[PDB]
Amino acid sequence: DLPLPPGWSVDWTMRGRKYYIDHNTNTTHWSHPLEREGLPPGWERVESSEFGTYYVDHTNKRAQYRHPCAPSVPPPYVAPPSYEG
């Protein structure tokens, strides 16, 4: 949907997974560069049918469920307003 910034292109893995090619920096990425609000450089949010939504750190070649910048404690439960309706 969102336009690629100048200097990018897209391709596909042998499993059908889209990736983004940055010809400005000669690097490749799982996510659109305009869809990384709140993420530090080197980190991406990824979606998995087996593991759900998690985060990868390309600079350390590791992954974790928690956003890199989230408090290192479990996140807060909040319910929507009760049915009124």
Footprint on this chain of its own copies (rule: CB under 8 A):
9, 11, 13, 17, 19-23, 26-30, 38, 45, 48-58, 61-67, 69-71, 74-83, 85
CA gyration radius for the chain?
16
Tokens representing 10?
């897209």
Q: Please give the helix or strand (H or E) that residue 10 lies within, else none.
A: strand 8-12
Question: Could you say which of 2, 3, 6, 49 contacts K ion (CB under 5 A)?
Answer: 6
Q: How far is the CB of 3 from its own copies (least distance, A)?
A: 19
- The answer to the question of residue 65 lying near K ion (CB under 5 A) is yes
| Minimal CB distance residue for K ion | 7
Residue number, 3 or 71, with CB nearest to its own copies:
71
Q: Please, which of residues 35-54 interact with K ion by CB under 5 A?
A: 53
Do the Cβ atoms of 22 and 10 come closer than 8 Å?
A: no
Torsional sign, CA 20, 31, 72, 69: positive
